[PDB]
Amino acid sequence: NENRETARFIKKHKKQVTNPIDEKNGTSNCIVRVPIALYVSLAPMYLENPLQGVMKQHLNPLVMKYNNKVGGVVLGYEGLKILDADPLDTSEKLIKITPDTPFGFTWCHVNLYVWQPQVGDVLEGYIFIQSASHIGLLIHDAFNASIKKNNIPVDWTFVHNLGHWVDSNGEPIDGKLRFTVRNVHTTGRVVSVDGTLIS
């Protein structure tokens, strides 16, 4: 009864393509390409140059925001492909005006590149600064990460002042750091990232 209806939910959230642990760097692979289909609203003023109107109005505000459909921060795009409404490739394709507006909508294929964080991932990025209960990071010079003492073992104390870190070797820690990513929380507009250290 309620065993095949749960498959509507298990298949709902779980992303298919994983992040395999590639080239033995410790990092997995998280920059991933997927092609999509929009549903644009072309301006009347971009009737003469309809390729510039689709990109500027719906694709230039598309990069560098977390997108709830792909499940990733959109890094970049290239290659708009406006379809046609005459199933006759060529130049003069034709789009369909809404009956009440002068705004005519159409279909576009376009190609995206996003960032793919998951659970069970291990990544490496520079640390900016730290504290005695949390350590913050930067990934790919675009992506934050934070490691807190509830992810950090006990014997790693803190030299106190900017106060630096004390590990079980007694050293302030370097920039680049290997870490395991916990649940990502997209509450703020800035995409916040949580992470762990223990296996």
Partner: protein
């Protein structure tokens, strides 16, 4: 003009799975979150989260 555009021209929100108009709803956000649009009968509470 005379039955929508100048009497009750309303742009409501429709859930595209259950097919309703009333039961859509602007989300009351978390204090740093952004008010999105979420429906009611497609929405089940978090308590049903078995494995």
């Amino acid at each position: 003009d005379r039955l929508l555009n100048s009497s009750d021209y309303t742009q409501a929100s429709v859930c595209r799975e259950c097919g309703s108009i009333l039961t859509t709803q602007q989300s009351v956000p978390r204090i740093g979150s952004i008010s999105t649009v979420c429906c009611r009968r497609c929405s089940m509470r978090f308590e049903d989260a078995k494995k």
